[PDB]
Design a protein around this ligand. Structure first.
Ligand code: CL
Ligand code: CL
Ligand code: NA
Ligand code: NA
Length: 129
């Protein structure tokens, strides 16, 4: 599923991401825009052999099991394919574990390089929330 901007904001808010660990909703929508272009089916392979999955591009070396990342952990205890669903519940619950691990949203390279320090509230402007 390819989400609309305000559609995704509303979905993330209902799942408890607004201000989670201090990150306003605009941060999560900006991260999804540049990680996946709001497409839940997005996948990208990394140089080390791991793969990134879903709307928030969660990586198989630490967070999910895809059966082809040797020596990986499965810290969200989920198959990576569950992160591609049109229902974002599994992606959100895993993102909450990631963002609590110590480095905040800097775990997402695109947030650091394209959202951090910008006017992120613009990503929710005009939405009925
Ligand atoms: Cl915001
Ligand atoms: Cl980047
Ligand atoms: Na929308
Ligand atoms: Na893994």
């Amino acid at each position: 599923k390819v989400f609309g901007r305000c559609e995704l904001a509303a979905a993330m808010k209902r799942h408890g991401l607004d201000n989670y660990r201090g990150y306003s909703l605009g941060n999560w929508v900006c991260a999804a825009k540049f990680e996946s272009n709001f497409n839940t089916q997005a996948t990208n392979r990394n140089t080390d052999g791991s793969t990134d999955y879903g709307i928030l591009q969660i990586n198989s070396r630490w967070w999910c099991n895809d059966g082809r990342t040797p020596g990986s952990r499965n810290l969200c205890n989920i198959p990576c394919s569950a992160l591609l669903s049109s229902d974002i519940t599994a992606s959100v619950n895993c993102a909450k574990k990631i963002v609590s691990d110590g480095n905040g949203m800097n775990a997402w390279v695109a947030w650091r390089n394209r959202c951090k320090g910008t006017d992120v509230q613009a990503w929710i402007r005009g939405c009925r929330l």
